[PDB]
Amino acid sequence: PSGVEGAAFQSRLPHDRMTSQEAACFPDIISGPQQTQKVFLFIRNRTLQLWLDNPKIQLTFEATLQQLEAPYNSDTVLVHRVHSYLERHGLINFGIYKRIKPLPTKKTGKVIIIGSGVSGLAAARQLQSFGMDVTLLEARDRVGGRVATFRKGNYVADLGAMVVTGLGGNPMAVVSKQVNMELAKIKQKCPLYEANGQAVPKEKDEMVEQEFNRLLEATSYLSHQLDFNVLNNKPVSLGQALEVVIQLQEKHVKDEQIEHWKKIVKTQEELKELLNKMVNLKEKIKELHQQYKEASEVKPPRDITAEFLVKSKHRDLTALCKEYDELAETQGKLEEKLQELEANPPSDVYLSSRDRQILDWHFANLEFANATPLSTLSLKHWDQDDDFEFTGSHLTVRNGYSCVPVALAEGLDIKLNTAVRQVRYTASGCEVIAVNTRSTSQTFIYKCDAVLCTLPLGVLKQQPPAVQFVPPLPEWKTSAVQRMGFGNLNKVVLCFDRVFWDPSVNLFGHVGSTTASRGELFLFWNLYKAPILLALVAGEAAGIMENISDDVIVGRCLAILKGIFGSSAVPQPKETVVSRWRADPWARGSYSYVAAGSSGNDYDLMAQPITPGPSIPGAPQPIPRLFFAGEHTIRNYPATVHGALLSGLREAGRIADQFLGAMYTL
Amino acid sequence: RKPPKGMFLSQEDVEAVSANATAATTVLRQLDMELVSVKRQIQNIKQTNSALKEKLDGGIEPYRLPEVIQKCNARWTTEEQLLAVQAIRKYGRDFQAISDVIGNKSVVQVKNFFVNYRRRFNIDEVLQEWEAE
Amino acid sequence: ARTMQTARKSTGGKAP
Ligand SMILES: Cc1cc2nc3c(=O)[nH]c(=O)nc-3n(C[C@H](O)[C@H](O)[C@H](O)COP(=O)(O)OP(=O)(O)OC[C@H]3O[C@@H](n4cnc5c(N)ncnc54)[C@H](O)[C@@H]3O)c2cc1C
C-alpha cells in the first residue's frame, strides 16, 4: 500500500477506521461525527508516515504540526493528542533514533525490567525515553535472550531468532533502517532429498505437498464446520485430527475399491446366469436338430403330417437359433463391460511408504513452525494469528541478528550476570531480589515502583520455580502459564572451509526414515557469506537430541550431507555448534505455541499486569505493579522477535500511562 | 461450507474412527477382509464362467440350417391348407411361425386363411383345442 | 506458529 494509507499498513493499523486502542484515548472522536474521525485518521496516518519516512531521528510535535496543512493543522490540540498517543504507544519514536530534545535531566518513577531480551530492551528504551529510571536485570552475560548469535573468526550463525518474516507491516523494518542489519532475501526454492540422498522427483514433491495442504484444510474443516474439538473429554490436537483425516482417506480408498470389485461381481454374475441360458439352448438345440434330422430321414413322398414335422421342427429350430444368437450378443456386451471395469481399477493405496515419508517432512515443518510435536498443538487455534502475517519475502540478517539487541542495549543500565530469584510486589512498591550468577552468594535487592517481567514462558513454568513471586501469582495467571505451550527447536551449525553445496539455493530438505524422526535434521539453511550450513532439529527430535553429544549429532549431519552430495564432497566442519534451548535455564525452551486446551486468549491473560492487595485493610485499591512482556504475551504476534519487541512497546506505554499519567485523553 | 474436493469427511464417518482407540484400525481391517472376500468371489465366478464358456465351444454352428428363399405365393395348394391347420393346431395365433412352416405365404396370407376357411377348416375347435395346452 | 514458516510454507486452513 502507498501514501498515508501505506503508513497505517506499515504500522499494522487500518487506514480508514479507528482501532479499539484509539477509541480508548479518543472516545470523544469515535463517538463523534464522521468528519472529525476522518480528520483524526488523517493526522494518525500522516504522523505515522512522517515518522516512517525517517525513523532515524525523533519526530517532535513541532515538526509534525509544521508539516500538517489546513484543514488538519488548524486544530493543534488534536494534533498534540494524536502525536502523543502515537509516541506513547511506540508507533513513532521507538527504536534507535537521534533524540532531538535531549533526555529529561531528572527522572520520574523507577522500573525494574527482568531480562534483556528484545522485549525487555524494547521497553527499557521506551521507558527511559519517557523520563523514567529503568534498569534491567539479566541472568546471562549478554543481551538478546533468544536472539543468540554464534561468532568465530569470519563465521556468524544465529542459534535463536534468524529470519525476519517479511517487512510488510513489520516493526523490524523501522529497526533495520535505524541499524546496520545486512538483510538478505531468502529464496523460495527448497528441494527435498529422501533418506537415500537423492531428490524427490518433481512428480512426488508436488503430489505430497498438495495432499499435505488438503489434509490441513480438512483438519480446519473438521474443527470449524464439524466442531470436532473434543474427543474422550480431551481437546483434539492437530496431530490427532490429521490422523482422523488420513484414516478417513484410507477408509475411502478401500470403500471405493470394494464397490468397484462389487461391480465386477455384479457383472461376472450376469455373465454367469447368461452362460447358463446359453448352455441350455445349445442343448435344447442339440436335440431339436436330432429330431429334425430324423424327421428328414423319412424320404418323400410324405403324408402331410410327416411333412409338417419336418417343417415345424425346422421353424422351431431356427427360433431357438435366433435366441442363442441374440444371447451371444448380450454375452459379447457383458464380456466387454468386464475388462472395462477390470482395466479401470480405482486407487490402490492412499499413500505409499515413500509418500508418507515425504508427507512427514511437511509435518516436521509444522512441528518446526510451532516448535512442538503436532500432538500438543490446539486443533482449533494453533494458527490463530495467521491474519497478522506480514507481506513480502522473508529475510536473514547476514551480520548476525544479535546486532539488533546489542544496538538496542546502547544507552541502558543493564546488570548482566544478575539472576532474579524473588519478585516481591506490594501496595507501596516492589523489591526484586537477585543473585550474581558467578558467586550466587552475592545477593542484590532492587526497589522499584513497578517490575516489567519478560521471563521466558518456559522459565515461568519451572516446577520448582526459578523465581518466586511474593505474593504468589493469582490463579488466573498461573493457569494461563500451565495451559499455554512452550515448545522447543534446536539448531546445528556447520562451518566448512569450502562451499560444497548449491550456493544459490538458500535451503533444502532432508526426508527422514521414520515418522518418529521426522524432525531430526529435516531442513538445512545456506544463509551466510562464509561456508556455513545450518540444520534444524524440530518436533519430537528436538527434545531427544539434547541428550546426544555434538559429535553423534554432527555425525548424523555429515552423513546426510554425504549421502546427498557425495561421501567425498563433504569435508570435516572446521567448527560446530549445537543449541540446546530446552536445557538452557534462562529459556527452558524455544518459543510458545497454542497448546491443545489453550487459545489465543491465554496470550492475553499473560499480558494482564498484576495488582497487589492493599497493605492497610480498607485502603483504596492499588495501582498495578507487576507488568509482563515477551513473545508469549502478544496474541497477534506470538513466538517471534517482532512480536516480542511489540510487546515491550505495549508494556512501556502501559507502565508510563500508569506512573506518568496520560495527558492525551481529555 | 464443504471439505477440499476428494476428502471424505462426512459427519457419520468421523465418530466411526474416533468412537474408541482402534475403532480406526478396526473398521479398516473390516474393509480389508471385505476386499479379499469379494476378490476370491470374483475369481470363483471367473472360474465357474470359464467352465460354462468352454461347454459352449462350437457355438450352435453344427446345428444351423440354410435359408429357404421362396417367393410368397398367392394360392393355397391343398397341401399348404393342411400345413396350415397343423401349424394352427401347434402354434395357435402365431401368424408368423405359421408363415414359416407353410413357407411360401406372408404373415398376412396366414390371417386371411383364418376367416376365409373359417367354416370349412374348423379353426375355432382347432384354436380351442390348442388352448387345452 | 504458521507465520514462522519460510521453507515450503503450508497453506491448508489458511484464509486465502
Ligand atoms: C531456535 C529459535 C529460533 C528462532 N527463530 C526465530 C526467527 O527466525 N524469527 C523470529 O521472529 N523469531 C524467532 N525466534 C523467537 C525469538 O527468538 C523470541 O520470540 C524472542 O527473541 C523472545 O524475546 P523475549 O524478549 O520475549 O524473551 P527472551 O529473548 O528469552 O528474553 C528473556 C530474558 O530473560 C532472561 N532471564 C531468564 N531467566 C531470568 C532470571 N531468573 N533472572 C533474570 N533474567 C532472566 C534471559 O536470559 C533473557 O535474556 C526463535 C527462537 C528460537 C528459540
- Main beta-sheet annotation of chain A: 5 strands, parallel
Radius of gyration computed on alpha carbons of chain B = 33 Å
- Please tell me what the overall shape of chain A is: elongated
Strand count of chain B: 0
Modified residues (N6,N6,N6-trimethyllysine) (chain C): 4, 9
Modified residues (Phosphothreonine) (chain C): 3, 6, 11
Modified residues (Phosphoserine) (chain C): 10
Protein name (chain C): Histone H3.3C
Description:
Chain A has 19 helices and 23 strands. Chain A has 666 residues and is an alpha+beta fold. Helix content of chain A is 42%, strand content 14%. Chain B is mainly alpha-helical and 133 residues long. Chain B contains six helices and no strands. In chain B, helix 3 (78-91) crosses helix 4. The longest helix of chain B has 33 residues, at 23-55. Chain C has no helix or strand. In chain C, 50% of the residues are buried. Chains in contact: A-B, A-C. Chains A and B meet through helix 9, helix 10 and helix 11 of A and helix 1, helix 2, helix 3 and helix 4 of B. The structure holds flavin-adenine dinucleotide. Residues 114-120, 137-140, 145-147, 160-163, 165, 419-420, 454-456, 459, 466-467, 489, 491, 581, 586-587, 590-591, 630-631, 639-642, 644 of chain A line the site of flavin-adenine dinucleotide. It is classed as oxidoreductase. The entry lists the keywords Histone Code, Demethylase, Flavin, oxidoreductase. It forms a trimeric assembly. LSD1-CoREST bound to Acetylated K14 of Histone H3.
Summed up:
Chain A has 666 residues and is of the alpha+beta class. Chain A is 42% helix and 14% strand. By secondary structure, chain B is an all-alpha fold.
List keywords for this structure.
heterotrimer, A: 666 residues, alpha+beta, Arc Repressor Mutant, subunit A, 5-stranded parallel β-sheet, 5-stranded antiparallel β-sheet, elongated, B: 133 residues, mainly alpha, Methane Monooxygenase Hydroxylase, Chain G, domain 1, 61% helix, binds flavin-adenine dinucleotide, histone H3K9 demethylase activity (chain A), ubl conjugation (chain A), flavin adenine dinucleotide binding (chain A), nuclear androgen receptor binding (chain A)
